[model samples]
Target: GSSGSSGMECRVCGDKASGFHYGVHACEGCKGFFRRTIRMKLEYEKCERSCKIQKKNRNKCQYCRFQKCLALGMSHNAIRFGSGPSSG
Candidate 1:
């Protein structure tokens, strides 16, 4: 469950990573991109997006990742999924 919220640092920028992947903390743009890539097990073609990312521009277009999640307004539950199946 490498959701990315384990108090880790953002892979793109040196800033403190937020949520499981991307957010005001880490930012979904990076998270969703990773998910879709790994989930589909596909390789991204050589593109300008490959350059290293920084905090200021991390929230740019998000067409590469965040678009899908942000548009759907993905729930946090969608993020931290396997939390031991409830306390009750």
Candidate 2:
């Protein structure tokens, strides 16, 4: 799940990525956005499921953004929990 370093493009939105997020190289915004969207179990009926996902337009469509996340090979298994004692 590690790309080992930065200088990679985000596989989701084509943004400048910092390293691995989930299992793919993604930008901080996309990484956080993906987590929040999934954690909330959101739905976007107004979406066409084909929205463009560049850095400036990533927020325009939630469904497509999420779809791209999956398309890019980001695995939910790579999501890490907190190190706190109660965390799992």
Candidate 3:
């Protein structure tokens, strides 16, 4: 992650990202979040999850999975033209 006084770190896993996964760049968290979000769309019926992320327990927390999108730097305006990773 780049050094900054804003305290803005990659919401995903602290890795450097260009932007939010929805926008441009993503860290492992967002990357994994994007992957899991698309793959398990049906399982996320409960929207009461937190997405704020950390590398240590990322696998056990879906709440953090989603929040990582915005907390990180994901632009939310990323290009959306391709199918999910599995389909690709």
- How many steric overlaps are in each model, in order? 9, 0, 12
- Residue-level lDDT of model 1, residues 1-88, one tens digit each, is 5356445665554456555553434444566565565445555343456444566665544343433444334344444456566666
How close is every model to the real structure, measured as TM-score?
Answer: 0.36, 0.72, 0.45
Comparing 1 with 2 on TM-score, the higher-scoring candidate is 2
Worst lDDT 10-window in candidate 2: 79-88
Candidate with best lDDT: 2
Model 3 per-residue lDDT at 57: 54
TM-score of 3: 0.45
lDDT (10s digit) by residue, model 3, range 47-73: 465444555655766655665554645
lDDT of each: 0.49, 0.76, 0.55
Instruction: Evaluate model 2: give its lDDT.
Output: 0.76
In model 1, state the lDDT of residue 50.
40
Ranking by TM-score: 2, 3, 1
